[PDB]
Amino acid sequence: TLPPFLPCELQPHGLVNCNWLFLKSVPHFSAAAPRDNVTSLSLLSNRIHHLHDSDFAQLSNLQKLNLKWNCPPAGLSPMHFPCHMTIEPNTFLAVPTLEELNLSYNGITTVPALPSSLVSLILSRTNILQLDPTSLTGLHALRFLYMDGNCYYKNPCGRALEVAPGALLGLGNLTHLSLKYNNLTTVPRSLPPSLEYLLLSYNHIVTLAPEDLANLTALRVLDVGGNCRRCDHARNPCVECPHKFPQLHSDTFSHLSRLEGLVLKDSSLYQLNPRWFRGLGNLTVLDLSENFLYDCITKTKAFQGLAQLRRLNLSFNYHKKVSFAHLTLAPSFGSLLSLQELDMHGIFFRSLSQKTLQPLARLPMLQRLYLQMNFINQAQLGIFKDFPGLRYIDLSDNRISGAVESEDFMPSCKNLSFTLDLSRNNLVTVQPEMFAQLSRLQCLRLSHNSISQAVNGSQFVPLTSLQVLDLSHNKLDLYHGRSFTELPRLEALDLSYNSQPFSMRGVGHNLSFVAQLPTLRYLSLAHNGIHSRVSQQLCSTSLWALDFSGNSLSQMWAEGDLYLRFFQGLRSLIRLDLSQNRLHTLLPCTLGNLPKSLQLLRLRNNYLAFFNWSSLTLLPNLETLDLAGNQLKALSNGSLPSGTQLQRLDVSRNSIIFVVPGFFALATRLRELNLSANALRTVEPSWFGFLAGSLEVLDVSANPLHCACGAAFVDFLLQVQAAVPGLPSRVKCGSPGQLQGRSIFAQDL
Amino acid sequence: TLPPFLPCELQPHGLVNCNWLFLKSVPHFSAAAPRDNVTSLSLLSNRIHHLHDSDFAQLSNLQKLNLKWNCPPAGLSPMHFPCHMTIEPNTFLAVPTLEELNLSYNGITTVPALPSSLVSLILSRTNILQLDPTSLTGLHALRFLYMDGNCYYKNPCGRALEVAPGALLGLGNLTHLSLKYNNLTTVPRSLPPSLEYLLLSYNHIVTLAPEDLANLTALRVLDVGGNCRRCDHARNPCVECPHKFPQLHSDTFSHLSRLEGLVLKDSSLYQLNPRWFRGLGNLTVLDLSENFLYDCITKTKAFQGLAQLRRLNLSFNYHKKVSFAHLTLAPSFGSLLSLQELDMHGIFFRSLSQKTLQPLARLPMLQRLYLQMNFINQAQLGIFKDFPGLRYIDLSDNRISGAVEEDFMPSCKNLSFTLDLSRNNLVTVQPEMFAQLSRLQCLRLSHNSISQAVNGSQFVPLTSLQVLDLSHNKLDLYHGRSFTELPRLEALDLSYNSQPFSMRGVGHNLSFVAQLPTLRYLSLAHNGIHSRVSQQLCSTSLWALDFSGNSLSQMWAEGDLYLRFFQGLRSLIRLDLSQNRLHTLLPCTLGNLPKSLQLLRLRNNYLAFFNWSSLTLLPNLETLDLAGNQLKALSNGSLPSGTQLQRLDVSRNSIIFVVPGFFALATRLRELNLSANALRTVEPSWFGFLAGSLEVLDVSANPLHCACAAFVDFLLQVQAAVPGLPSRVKCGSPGQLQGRSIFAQDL
DNA sequence: CATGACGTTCCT
DNA sequence: CATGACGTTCCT
Ligand SMILES: *[C@@H]1O[C@H](CO)[C@@H](O[C@@H]2O[C@H](CO)[C@@H](O)[C@H](O)[C@H]2NC(C)=O)[C@H](O)[C@H]1NC(C)=O
Ligand SMILES: *[C@@H]1O[C@H](CO)[C@@H](O[C@@H]2O[C@H](CO)[C@@H](O)[C@H](O)[C@H]2NC(C)=O)[C@H](O)[C@H]1NC(C)=O
Ligand SMILES: *[C@@H]1O[C@H](CO)[C@@H](O)[C@H](O)[C@H]1NC(C)=O
Ligand SMILES: *[C@@H]1O[C@H](CO)[C@@H](O)[C@H](O)[C@H]1NC(C)=O
Ligand SMILES: *[C@@H]1O[C@H](CO)[C@@H](O)[C@H](O)[C@H]1NC(C)=O
Ligand SMILES: *[C@@H]1O[C@H](CO)[C@@H](O)[C@H](O)[C@H]1NC(C)=O
Ligand SMILES: *[C@@H]1O[C@H](CO)[C@@H](O)[C@H](O)[C@H]1NC(C)=O
Ligand SMILES: *[C@@H]1O[C@H](CO)[C@@H](O)[C@H](O)[C@H]1NC(C)=O
Ligand SMILES: *[C@@H]1O[C@H](CO)[C@@H](O)[C@H](O)[C@H]1NC(C)=O
Ligand SMILES: *[C@@H]1O[C@H](CO)[C@@H](O)[C@H](O)[C@H]1NC(C)=O
Ligand SMILES: *[C@@H]1O[C@H](CO)[C@@H](O)[C@H](O)[C@H]1NC(C)=O
Ligand SMILES: *[C@@H]1O[C@H](CO)[C@@H](O)[C@H](O)[C@H]1NC(C)=O
Ligand SMILES: *[C@@H]1O[C@H](CO)[C@@H](O)[C@H](O)[C@H]1NC(C)=O
Ligand SMILES: *[C@@H]1O[C@H](CO)[C@@H](O)[C@H](O)[C@H]1NC(C)=O
Ligand SMILES: *[C@@H]1O[C@H](CO)[C@@H](O)[C@H](O)[C@H]1NC(C)=O
Ligand code: NA
């Protein structure tokens, strides 16, 4: 049975996904298709420039419709091609069940007629420059109206968006209104008092008064940021904001008793008026980033009594010309008893001392502290010892150099109690004194420093709780046998991208320390170019995962018998990545020397042109084998051996032309098979002994299928269509003639 | 007309190249083949296990025959498969013109009968474990005999190679003998006195006496290294050599009056007996590397008076356990008046001072000094000011951190004075380090840890510096006078300084480029430049800019800010825009590249469309590299008229068709790469049936449809321009022809 | 026959 | 029916 909505794909929850199919018109599906079951129709980024009364009328129960990016205005078109989208009068009225409509990134200049069922309407990046009471007539259920970006540098219009006074008052249920990037100079008058979210950023609203927020006492979030910009900080085209601005009335916000979030970023503020925050008893999030508040934060009383604030962003409040020698936060920060997160990155100050953050030092709920990108060159990390709630400190991208004068292979630190990021700093050695008061730390990131030390067990002595240590992207000289032995709780160690020492031709290195790390579970030695003069064996009874990608096992395993048991003493290993090791050849003997406990083996992006399948019996616990990106020319030379517990096999991006009958048939636990990006001209059920119904994933995309009438693959792919990703569109013909590059369904074979 | 020696390829100077064709037997070429043109036949790395009397018998002018790697011994086989090569009695006698034979990496246990014309014979990595007077009968013209590696860890045999006393004396013209890796314990007796090169390294010859070199007074090179090894330094399996060894006689070499080169590397030497080198009046090259000579070199008189010596290698004479605080070379080094090159890398000493190298400092001819990998942490670079001859110092891979308490980027090989300080521990650059190095023309500082905001103060003394390599550092580029203190600067490598450009929210500034009035070559490659940078690069001097590995994608999406970024490079002729994540181009932004451009690389982007007509905006463009993009056709108009384009690379795209006449108006086109696309045909119509001016047309790695097709006749017509035509141009279809050469069958 | 096309965007 | 095969090796 054909996919029911060709050329589109039926996805869960009644979604017909027609995205990125280069359609010039809305598909008309068969009277035989289950049109009644379609609840969402996605037409993202097709080339539909004309919508008709008939387009959606046969989808009797359509609730959600996405027409984004079909006819982009010239400014947003990659080639600046103009586009005007025409819409027949009843296009959307013909869908009286429609609840959500996305019409963004289309060249339309007026709002079409819309059914009164509508709950959510997105008209952003269109060319609609006016809203009046007739524009959205009858939409009494509308909760969300987003119309951002109809007049700005990427979509210019030569004037302001004009929203007539009271234009939206008929929208009695409207809770969310966003009108960003519309070249506004004033807040539209008499907006719906139902509003909870009003987003007016990146216009030119440079004066704000309580009258501009009349009757909006239901507001939970107000964003007026980016209206009076500091263009020194801009990454994009930026209009200068004259120095008399902004002009905020002291009582602008005082009636917004329900306000939870206020965004005043990128407003050229040199002053905080405490009166702005005084009526705001429910305020939990305040964004003051990208202002000129560097001196203000040393003295302000504006945080006095804001004992409910949870998140405060003061990032990029930097002085144009300078960094500060010292920075001392105002006493009023000590009032912020609910504060959980403080972002102070990008301010630029040279010293972090006890005085710097003293008012924060007893805040009981302060969990996250962002101090990155501050050009700090002296930091007393001991200041943090007694912060009672700290989970996470980001001190990355600083110039600290010492004491004061995927997850299957490497876990993240997100679930840990206390994490310090000192990555992208200027350490060349590690001295334990810098860590003396950080014994509570569970995770420490030191990646991308300049550490060139021969570590030896003396560096990390204070770090008695440390579980995870990231030393990636340094120059550690590994040879001392007691490296990292001073870390009693170390479970994960990342030594990836420490290749320089290993590249020193003729100088030996030593990985015997690995055996002396009794709790180590995850290790990376990836991208180190390890290739000669190293330990003959890695040993560990604890290790579960080893990333050895990006080395030269090719060289090592060509060196007589020296390295043939390199991984064998990893007696508990379950995951091993040998990708990108320049392997042109393996031995069965060498595969039988990997740990018997192995469950997952990656050999991606090597140069293997032959693989001895029968050797898989030497890894009885193997579940996943990844051979993607090698040079296999066939799946032959026997077939997958019996008794295999293999569940997942990836042979994508090889050069496979042929698979022998039965190749996969004895791998009774096989569930996921990737054959994508090979040279297969057919897909044969005989490869599976005609028992392919247990597969959950069978990816045959990017193969030169021969689209002749009655090829095996047609019927077969239909039989296992639930397993084949992208079947309707991404499974293409290589031949014959004009079918090359087309879907196998472009024609009925 | 078919290629004349299918399945092989005819190459220049009468070479028939049959390499890597998986052949199981020597080809018998067509009846009409021009066999008298075959002066060399290469059969490297096929799977020919049986050679026959008739194999080479019709090749009447054959001079050179390469059969290497056809039947490797088990130890050398990638899978340890055994192989024995059989050779019929007259296989080579049938070629009385044969001068050079390579039989290495084949499982043979005896030497075949060979023609008396033979000049060179390579029998290495075979299983021949004896040579007797009957092994090489009648080869009176033989000058070279290489038989290395017939008994060692990769090809074991369980005994020594046995060369009978006087076995080779009938080789009256023999000048080169190599018998390395053969498990020898003594030098074979009574070797030919004609010998000039005798190579005996990596055996177990641990005693050497003048009698072991009897009558070999024509020797120019003797290599006995690696016979008594230090296994601590070994990268491979290594047999420890008992401490009583080696045993050399004081006069072992004294009769070798013509000796030019002597190799005593990896011999476990703790002593140098000056008598070894006295009387070697012609000695120019001495290799003493990988011994234990670290104390010996501070005191030895062994170099006293060795006035002819030009090259001395003392590398990796390190102490097992330690580095030395100081190292002082012996006074005798001051007598090496001919010395041109001294290799002292890998000895391990912490300080380089005036005293360290004092004996070298007046040697008039000393040009190259190798001091890398020494763990040096203090270096007074001013010591070098007054060395009269110095061209090149390698101080890479050390721990120096400051003063003591090609068409895109030229190399420094032609300059007067180059210092390599790459892979050191600089975090800033202080001018004082360089105060006495004003003469330098090239300075390499790659792979240090330099994190400074350069500002025009760093390099003040370097008033002759032409080339400066700062790749692989963390330089913060924003000061407007960076590098302006270098008045001769012509080439600057700032590649791989990505960390600062990766600081999201923090701006950088490239305006200093405009202030470098002699700059010709600049690399900003692999910097991840993507936002908050100068809107324009400006230079009237620059010829070449490598901007590969950035994010012009992001920059050119940012309204109009960066649309003129390269336009002010008013003399630019080469630009690399590869790997910039480009999914699209504007025609107007290609027309904002300098009109002077000759070469534009756009490799490894994600371009699925290209507006060919935009090429008229670059009137001087000769080379366009679009390899590794996502083009699905060559269409959308042709190459425009008037183009000077000579070279076009569209390899590794997804091209499935080319419109008729696509290439026809590109009258200067000479080189076209279509490799690794999805083309099922090759059509002369693409060229308007005028493809004869092409010098290179690469159509390899395309799924050609091998039906009884345009391409067949066409490729034979332009065969001189098609690389690898006999073997690497393959069928995608139909049926069993998939993956075979288009010549595997007659289409 | 006042319209196509480009292309995984968009963010600031 | 005492043999094939693997592969761009080899270096120390
Ligand atoms: C099968 O393999 C292909 C290609 O090897 C996968 O496609 C890639 O997917 C990864 C992440 O999963 C991306 O990083 C690549 O950029 C994709 N490239 C292409 C060309 O598609 C594909 O996802 C795999 N299939 C499944 C079901 O996992
Ligand atoms: C045509 O293009 C192909 C592929 O893009 C070239 O093949 C590559 O050549 C370079 C060396 O120049 C190697 O680094 C790659 O590994 C090669 N890959 C393959 C698959 O061959 C080919 O050399 C080009 N042809 C000519 C005549 O220059
Ligand atoms: C809001 O919408 C609901 C339907 O979702 C409707 O029943 C209710 O009457 C509407 N209220 C107003 C004020 O329009
Ligand atoms: C914004 O409006 C002003 C004044 O009407 C106009 O000059 C300017 O062109 C407009 N900006 C844009 C991007 O269209
Ligand atoms: C605010 O609402 C009151 C009645 O609730 C009305 O009198 C007044 O006009 C409203 N203000 C605006 C600006 O719409
Ligand atoms: C929060 O807003 C409510 C209305 O939702 C108001 O009654 C209350 O006073 C506010 N809370 C505080 C602490 O002011
Ligand atoms: C480790 O090295 C440091 C300095 O490099 C040194 O002080 C300490 O003694 C060393 N520790 C050991 C165990 O050798
Ligand atoms: C590696 O270091 C260990 C010290 O734990 C030592 O026993 C061993 O000999 C060294 N091995 C190599 C190959 O350097
Ligand atoms: C593996 O199979 C291929 C054909 O699919 C064949 O050419 C080759 O000889 C086989 N190799 C082995 C070792 O059996
Ligand atoms: C050496 O070879 C030459 C030709 O290259 C030959 O004429 C001469 O007789 C040979 N000499 C000896 C001593 O065999
Ligand atoms: C070298 O010869 C010895 C003694 O005859 C023998 O024991 C050894 O196995 C040989 N070595 C090799 C690599 O065959
Ligand atoms: C060295 O040459 C002389 C004759 O020139 C000969 O008598 C003697 O046997 C030779 N020595 C050896 C070891 O062959
Ligand atoms: C450059 O920076 C150094 C410190 O690295 C400073 O001493 C010097 O004065 C600065 N030079 C200029 C020209 O600003
Ligand atoms: C770069 O510096 C120059 C002055 O040297 C200044 O004109 C320009 O604004 C700066 N550009 C950026 C992007 O910072
Ligand atoms: C480019 O050519 C392709 C045919 O290969 C065509 O589909 C596409 O519409 C053309 N684009 C333009 C801009 O002409
Ligand atoms: Na253990």
Side-chain angles (χ1 to χ4, degrees), chain B residues 82-257:
Chain B
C83 203
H84 176 61
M85 176 178 267
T86 67
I87 299 181
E88 289 183 8
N90 269 44
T91 301
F92 309 108
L93 287 322
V95 194
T97 53
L98 187 63
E99 291 177 6
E100 298 181 20
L101 181 63
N102 193 334
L103 273 178
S104 61
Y105 288 89
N106 292 307
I108 56 169
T109 65
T110 65
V111 189
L114 295 160
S116 57
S117 47
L118 207 74
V119 177
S120 172
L121 182 57
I122 304 171
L123 298 168
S124 308
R125 282 80 180 178
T126 59
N127 309 115
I128 298 170
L129 313 180
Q130 76 291 311
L131 294 171
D132 298 305
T134 68
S135 300
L136 294 163
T137 301
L139 309 172
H140 299 299
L142 199 75
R143 290 198 287 122
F144 312 76
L145 176 58
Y146 293 82
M147 195 171 90
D148 297 323
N150 285 14
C151 195
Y152 73 121
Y153 70 101
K154 290 196 188 182
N155 184 29
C157 82
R159 64 180 178 219
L161 165 70
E162 305 165 25
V163 187
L168 307 181
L169 287 176
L171 302 174
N173 262 303
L174 197 71
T175 56
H176 294 62
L177 182 55
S178 189
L179 293 170
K180 304 182 180 178
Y181 294 106
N182 280 325
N183 203 19
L184 295 170
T185 62
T186 59
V187 181
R189 303 294 94 178
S190 299
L191 290 168
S194 46
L195 282 178
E196 287 174 33
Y197 296 73
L198 174 63
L199 322 173
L200 293 171
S201 48
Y202 302 104
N203 285 286
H204 304 289
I205 301 171
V206 293
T207 305
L208 244 216
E211 300 95 337
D212 293 316
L213 305 168
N215 293 337
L216 303 188
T217 54
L219 282 176
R220 302 203 294 122
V221 177
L222 176 65
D223 184 348
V224 294
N227 278 280
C228 187
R229 301 182 68 198
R230 63 179 297 177
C231 299
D232 71 325
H233 194 237
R235 73 163 191 191
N236 63 341
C238 184
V239 182
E240 265 283 320
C241 181
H243 71 338
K244 71 193 283 203
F245 296 113
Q247 291 173 347
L248 290 77
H249 297 216
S250 71
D251 65 345
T252 294
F253 310 109
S254 65
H255 64 295
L256 308 173
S257 78

Side-chain angles (χ1 to χ4, degrees), chain B residues 25 55 64 97 133 188 247 324 357 557 720:
Chain B
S25 65
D55 285 351
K64 302 177 187 174
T97 53
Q247 291 173 347
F324 294 101
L357 303 177

Side-chain angles (χ1 to χ4, degrees), chain A residues 24 45 50 77 79 152-154 181 235:
Chain A
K24 298 146 148 282
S45 291
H50 309 288
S77 166
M79 303 291 181
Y152 72 121
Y153 68 103
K154 296 202 174 164
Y181 297 102
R235 71 163 198 194

